[PDB]
């Protein structure tokens, strides 16, 4: 399957508190592996997965230095953008940056990305060709003109197509026990009456990795996305995920309904049916 | 591994 390495950087201004709160996290696929918090004691990038712990002193010094440097530009940016939008110094605002790279299941480059948001909205982003920028408004245009003149795009592209994917491949190998595992979903069904012409069937998938998973309900072998209901996939907290889907059905039609579970851990799609 | 050394300001 495909893989990705992604980094997420958030800064929130805090008028009257002085410096903005800066939080950074890195991920491979669905697994977190580093963090930094401007307000924590260490002032270092910190490991959050065991496979990154094996990186030496130089690695950690490097990552720590880059992430701190990143917090400083985010802090400048919050002032600059405040000005661009003529906003009061009394309010708290947010800058977000995300970047990363994907690889195919051959582990060659598929795509790279780099995007930026101001107060939770798209601000500027590198297009897929990694040579050009899309800007959401005229503030963002001003940034685009600076970054074009600075040739930021070429630096990014050399990174995303080279370094990013090389280090991603390295993490997948070193962490292969964590990152190249699949944990197949454990599944079961619940039954609850409702309405009294109707009952709710809920199909459960627990303890699976990766997060990617497809649950559907069928009525007599027929795709049933019609008052069916899917919760957002949710982390169990132990590195696995959880999800369910629900269908509300006329009572005594229970047997007509089947739940279909697709997941990379499953050599074959599971079918479930209300049992007792 | 992060992009570096750093980014330009917006």
């Amino acid at each position, epitope marked *: 399957g495909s893989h990705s390495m992604r980094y997420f950087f958030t800064s929130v201004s805090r008028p009257g508190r002085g410096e903005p709160r800066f939080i950074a996290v890195g991920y491979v696929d669905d697994t977190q592996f580093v963090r930094f918090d401007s307000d924590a004691a260490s002032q270092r990038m910190e490991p959050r997965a065991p496979w990154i712990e094996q990186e030496g002193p130089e690695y950690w010094d*490097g990552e720590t230095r880059k992430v*701190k440097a990143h917090s400083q530009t985010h802090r400048v940016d919050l002032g600059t953008l405040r000005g661009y939008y003529n906003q009061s110094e009394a309010g708290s605002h947010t800058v977000q940056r995300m970047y990363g790279c994907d690889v195919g299941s051959d582990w060659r480059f598929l795509r790279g990305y780099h995007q930026y948001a101001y107060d939770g909205k798209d601000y500027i982003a590198l297009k897929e060709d990694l040579r050009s920028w899309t800007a959401a408004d005229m503030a963002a245009q001003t940034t685009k003109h600076k970054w074009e003149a*600075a040739h930021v795009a070429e630096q990014l592209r050399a*990174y995303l197509e080279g*370094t990013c994917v090389e280090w991603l491949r390295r993490y997948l190998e070193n962490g292969k026990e964590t990152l190249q595992r699949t944990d197949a979903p454990k599944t079961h069904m619940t039954h609850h009456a409702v309405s009294d012409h109707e009952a709710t069937l809920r199909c459960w998938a627990l303890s699976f990795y990766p997060a990617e998973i497809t649950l559907t309900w069928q009525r007599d072998g027929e795709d049933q996305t019609q008052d069916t209901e899917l919760v957002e996939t949710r982390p169990a907290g132990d590195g696995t995920f959880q999800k369910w889907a629900a269908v509300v059905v006329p009572s005594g039609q229970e047997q007509r309904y089947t739940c279909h579970v697709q997941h990379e851990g499953l050599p074959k799609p599971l079918t479930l049916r209300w049992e007792p | 591994y992060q992009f570096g*050394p750093d*980014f330009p300001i917006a």
Partner: T-cell receptor
Amino acid sequence: DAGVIQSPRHEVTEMGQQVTLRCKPISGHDYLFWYRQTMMRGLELLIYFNNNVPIDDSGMPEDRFSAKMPNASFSTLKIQPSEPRDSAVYFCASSLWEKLAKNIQYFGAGTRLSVLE
Amino acid sequence: KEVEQDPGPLSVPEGAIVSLNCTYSNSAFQYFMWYRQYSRKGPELLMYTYSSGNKEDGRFTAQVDKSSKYISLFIRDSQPSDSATYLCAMRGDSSYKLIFGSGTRLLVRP
């Protein structure tokens, strides 16, 4: 044309005293670098700052050397107590991201420091 | 992060091609530069290369071979005013910190 200003241009001093080297970066520049150069070690980075904060100080001597940037226009480097082996030319430089991407920085004229026994 | 460079000094006659080089051991270096320093002055950037081979500016050619970890600068048609110390420097992508060679003194004889 009017570049990085360093002070003093020359210093001849006795070991045991505090030495202060000063630099004002080019106006608008937001990186500042301190290097030293001797006969014995060649040319070496001591520290650099960005937005007034120290980013890399791996080249700082382990104890008599301290560098500060109180505001965007002023950096000092202090040696206390000074020793004859500190004798060197100290250069300060400043730059901007877009110049550093092409590996350009701008150097002051240096401070020539002799620390004598 | 050690870069080795021969001090020379080199003495060549005006019009000669000069060859300067450094070797290094850290495979993480990716940016390679040459500076000229006239005596009792600061260094002046001449040429810069990202990983990536060879480039030419006027009488100068800079080259990088990342497998042999060997970089060079060639100066065509050397002139007396090229007399100076020549220093290579390099870094990675994690810090703007430059690691320099010890320098090579060049005298071009008029």
